[PDB]
Ligand binder design. Structure first.
Ligand SMILES: CC(=O)Nc1ccccc1C(=O)O
Ligand SMILES: [K+]
Ligand SMILES: [K+]
Ligand SMILES: [K+]
Length: 272
């Protein structure tokens, strides 16, 4: 796409979207999850393109040409993300994560500090620790034998019974070139992130400087998930949530207009 660039980040060539929009801060930093790239954000980029600078970093061995790379985790994702922003001369940015991109976003808030990264939006990120099926998925992903079966179970959960053409295209075509090197790693990093931090919510409550964060999600759809968000929201003045009511675990693809309005509201609030 017309905004895709490549640059050496430390000892690694990384692709990134940068629309290089000459405009008032903050920059909007869209953070992919594991084993997909900027392609997940092509519709959200269209929504924001005119009014904001939009950067989408790809992770090591992520992008149009996936590749085996040495082991890394979310701490390196943060460093990779900041180096691209430093190279681009970006100061203030509003990070927005998809799913387990959320580990990068929260660590980026701690490392960048509340001046550089005053707020955050986490999209469709499992707020509780894995329930048995998701734990079984991560186990399958780490298995050199059963990793594809791992991704197949996840694709079933993410689509949640929906013939969602754009999301199916993302999973079965735009992720098709990712292999066991990425998927095994994702499974190790997510497993370890939960083990170490306990949960997304524990990690966010544990920031030195708490800041406005909104969780915008469509999945899971059960009332009991809406409750752990409502209970966390009552406990933490800085945490809010919106249920977007989209079909899939990919609101950036299937309700981009809705993702955009929340990102805009947080951007507008930083500009004041
Ligand atoms: C593309 C994507 O959502 N990444 C994942 C890969 C493995 C396990 C979980 C996820 C996730 O972030 O939901
Ligand atoms: K449909
Ligand atoms: K609140
Ligand atoms: K959705």
């Amino acid at each position: 796409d017309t905004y895709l660039h490549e640059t050496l980040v430390f000892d690694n060539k990384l692709s990134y979207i940068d629309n290089q929009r000459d405009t008032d801060g903050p920059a909007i930093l869209l953070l992919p999850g594991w084993c997909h790239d900027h392609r997940v954000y092509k519709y959200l980029i269209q929504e924001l393109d005119a009014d904001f600078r939009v950067i989408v970093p790809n992770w090591r061995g992520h992008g149009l040409s996936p590749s085996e790379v040495p082991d890394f985790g979310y701490q390196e994702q943060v460093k990779d993300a900041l180096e691209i922003l430093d190279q681009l001369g970006v100061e203030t940015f509003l990070p927005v994560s998809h799913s387990h991109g959320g580990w990068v976003l929260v660590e980026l808030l701690e490392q960048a500090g509340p001046e550089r990264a005053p707020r955050g939006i986490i999209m469709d990120w499992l707020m509780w620790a894995p329930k048995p099926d998701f734990a079984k998925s991560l186990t399958l992903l780490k298995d050199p034998e059963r990793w594809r079966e791992g991704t197949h179970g996840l694709f079933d959960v993410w689509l949640d019974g929906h013939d969602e053409k754009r999301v199916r295209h993302h999973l079965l075509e735009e992720m098709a070139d990712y292999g066991y090197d990425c998927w095994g790693r994702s499974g190790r990093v997510i497993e370890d992130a939960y083990g170490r931090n306990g949960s997304p919510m524990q990690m966010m409550a544990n920031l030195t400087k708490t800041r406005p964060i909104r969780h915008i999600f469509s999945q899971p759809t059960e009332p009991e998930y809406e409750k752990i968000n409502s209970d966390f929201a009552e406990q933490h003045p800085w945490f809010s949530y919106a249920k977007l009511g989209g079909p899939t675990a990919f609101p950036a693809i299937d309700v981009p207009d809705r993702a955009a309005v929340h990102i805009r509201e947080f951007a507008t609030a930083i500009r004041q």
